Design a protein around this ligand. Structure first.
Ligand SMILES: O=P(O)(O)O[C@@H]1[C@H](O)[C@H](O)[C@@H](OP(=O)(O)O)[C@H](OP(=O)(O)O)[C@H]1O
Length: 119
C-alpha cells in the first residue's frame, strides 16, 4: 500500500456517527476494513474525480473530506459491505474523515493527492 492506518469515518445516513476503520490507500483507491488483517474491504472508494479539502468539525479533530467539486447533488461512486455479506452502493455525498494527529492528517492528504493527480 501507499498508506495505511486507523482513521475515524463519519457515516452517510440519517444518524451520522464516527466509526474507527482501518484504511488502505493503493491503486488510486481508498479501502477500509474492520480489522487490519481482513482480506476483504468493508468499503471501496475509488478516488477518480474526487477532490480533498480540509474542514473543521465541532466534535472531532484533524478532519478532511473527499467530495465532488461543484457537485450538482450526485453521490460518490463507492461500495460498502453490510453485515449479511451484501455488496451495496455507498450512500455518501462526502466522506468526512478524522485523523488521530495533525501530522497524520497532513500525511494522508499528501498521499491521497498524489494518487488522484496521476491515474
Ligand atoms: O446503523 P446505521 O445508522 O445505518 O449506520 C451505519 C453503521 O454505522 C455502519 O456500521 C457503517 O458502515 P461501516 O461499518 O462500513 O463503517 C455505516 O457507514 P456508511 O454510511 O459510511 O455506510 C453507517 O451508515
Amino acid at each position: 500500500p501507499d498508506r495505511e492506518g486507523w482513521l475515524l469515518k463519519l457515516g452517510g445516513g440519517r444518524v451520522k456517527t464516527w466509526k474507527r476503520r482501518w484504511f488502505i490507500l493503493t491503486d488510486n483507491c481508498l479501502y477500509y476494513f474492520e480489522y487490519t488483517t481482513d482480506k476483504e474491504p468493508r468499503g471501496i472508494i475509488p478516488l477518480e474525480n474526487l477532490s480533498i479539502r480540509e474542514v473543521d468539525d465541532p466534535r472531532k479533530p484533524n478532519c478532511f473530506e473527499l467530495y465532488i467539486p461543484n457537485n450538482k447533488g450526485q453521490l460518490i461512486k463507492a461500495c460498502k459491505t453490510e453485515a449479511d455479506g451484501r455488496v451495496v452502493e455507498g450512500n455518501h455525498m462526502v466522506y468526512r474523515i478524522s485523523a488521530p494527529t495533525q501530522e497524520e492528517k497532513d500525511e494522508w492528504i499528501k498521499s491521497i493527492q498524489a494518487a488522484v493527480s496521476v491515474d
